[PDB]
């Protein structure tokens, strides 16, 4: 096999942490560098191909895309790291004073038995003109060469029966560390949307813990699957919206439909919020939390520069076989049934 992907062992957690970040330019505006959601879905798209030099210039191509569900990420903190001869070293983290039920749930393994007394003295530590919070924020701005944002996911807006959101750390590639820590100050308790991180025609690297297959039998026997994998260069085809109906509508199809198939995806619900439709196949299975970083570097070929003109979204039944896009088209083709009249 590949000797790089060793030791071929089970990961530390389902939420794999992002190993490296995109560099930094100290003149660029403040913007997030990685996003997270919940991968669950896969679907077929057709599009006309404006890729000149190819055998399919001004032709139409069918291809497989994946739908990661991405509820609006909520900022609950910021971390500052000093540059040492020993690597980086977190000197101060700061939180949001009033955090959701989801994250106070993340701080316990057994949620129901506890008195739910998580950040009581920390919120009481805030309870004045600031004084100590602004002291720690001065501490971050004075030192700390890089600044990373503590976020979490909106787990309840996702159909998952987990209730327990994931903490993460996302660096900022907007220059002047002052603007980093003050962007964070403008964003405590607030939420960050998907399309404020990504857009169409943008290459990303989705990282995921790879679908556990359990025990398996130099070509050696042992563990197969459940490894933390980084896959790079998956083009974003569509960023979606929850409130907006006709997400499944293209420039061509234009029928008022959601990208959610009939009876939803298999083993996972519908979509009730923002999503990213990424091309190809992201690692992990359905219901799996994926962390989407962006490219690391200027990765422009013509596979990264071209504009996607989506023509049609397959929303037919994945559970079973596909014959109808809408429920409306099932009973339009069928005629009327027994229990109808």
């Amino acid at each position: 096999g590949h000797l790089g992907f060793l030791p071929r062992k089970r990961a530390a957690s389902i939420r794999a942490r992002v190993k490296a970040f995109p560099k930094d330019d100290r003149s660029k505006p403040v913007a997030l560098t990685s996003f997270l959601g919940y991968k669950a879905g896969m679907t077929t798209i057709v599009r006309d191909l404006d890729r000149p030099g190819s055998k399919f210039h001004k032709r139409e191509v069918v291809e497989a895309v994946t739908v990661v569900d991405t509820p609006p990420v909520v900022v609950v903190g910021v971390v500052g790291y000093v540059e040492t001869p020993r690597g980086l070293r977190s000197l101060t983290t700061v939180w949001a004073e009033h955090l959701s039920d989801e994250v106070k749930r993340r701080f316990y393994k057994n949620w129901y038995k506890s008195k739910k007394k998580a950040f009581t003295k920390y919120s009481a530590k805030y309870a004045q003109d600031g004084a100590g919070i602004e002291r720690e924020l001065a501490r971050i701005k004075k030192y700390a060469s890089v600044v990373r944002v503590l976020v979490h996911t909106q787990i309840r807006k996702t159909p998952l029966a987990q209730k327990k959101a994931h903490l993460a750390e996302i660096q900022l590639n907007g220059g002047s560390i002052s603007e980093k820590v003050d962007w964070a100050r403008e964003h405590f308790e607030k939420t960050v949307a998907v399309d404020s991180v990504f857009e169409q025609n943008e290459m990303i690297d989705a990282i995921a813990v790879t679908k556990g297959h359990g025990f398996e039998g130099v070509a050696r026997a042992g563990q197969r699957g459940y490894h933390s994998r980084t896959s790079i260069n998956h083009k974003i085809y569509r960023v979606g919206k929850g409130d907006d109906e006709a997400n499944g509508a293209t420039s061509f199809d234009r029928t008022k439909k959601t990208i959610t198939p009939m009876g939803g995806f298999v083993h996972y619900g519908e979509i009730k919020n923002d999503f990213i439709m990424v091309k190809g196949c992201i690692p992990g299975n359905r219901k799996r939390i994926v962390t989407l970083r962006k490219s690391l570097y200027t990765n422009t070929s013509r596979k990264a520069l071209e504009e996607v003109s989506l023509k049609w979204i397959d929303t037919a039944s994945k559970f079973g076989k596909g014959r109808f896009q809408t429920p409306a088209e099932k009973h339009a083709f069928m005629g009327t049934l027994k229990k109808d009249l």
């Binding site: 057709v46 055998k55 399919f56 191509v61």
Partner: protein, 134 residues
């Protein structure tokens, strides 16, 4: 040699030791594959052809004029489910191929039955001797 433009991957249905029919009016009725020109190399894997690939093939049932000499053969019918870029998966009724010189010029004057879309695109003179495409 002969192939026009780039060549993209379609599924492989015709390995070495496969008898396909002959489609041109040259004289041969069938064709026995012996080698595939421009194939990959694994351990223990047989050379497998597909639609629109020049193979080296011998006549088994046909005119003695077309025999005595192993000659290039371009496969025009596959019968194994390959994929088109326009959504559909398709396959034909039988395996068929047409005989030509190394340059890609046809010996026969007409090709019977359907000729594959990919094969007619890659080989120009096959599409010149084509009655039916797709």
């Amino acid at each position: 040699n002969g192939a026009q433009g780039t060549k993209f991957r379609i599924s492989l249905g015709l390995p070495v030791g496969a008898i396909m029919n002959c489609a041109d009016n040259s004289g041969a009725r069938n064709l026995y594959i012996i080698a595939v020109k421009g194939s990959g190399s694994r351990l223990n894997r047989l050379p497998a052809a597909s639609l629109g690939d020049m193979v080296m093939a011998t006549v088994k049932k046909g005119k003695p004029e077309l025999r005595k000499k192993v000659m290039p053969a371009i496969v025009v019918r596959q019968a194994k489910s390959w994929r088109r870029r326009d959504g559909v998966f398709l396959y034909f009724e039988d395996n068929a191929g047409v005989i030509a010189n190394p340059k890609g010029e046809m010996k026969g004057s007409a090709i019977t039955g359907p000729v594959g879309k990919e094969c007619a695109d890659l080989w120009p003179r096959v599409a010149s001797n084509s009655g039916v495409v797709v």
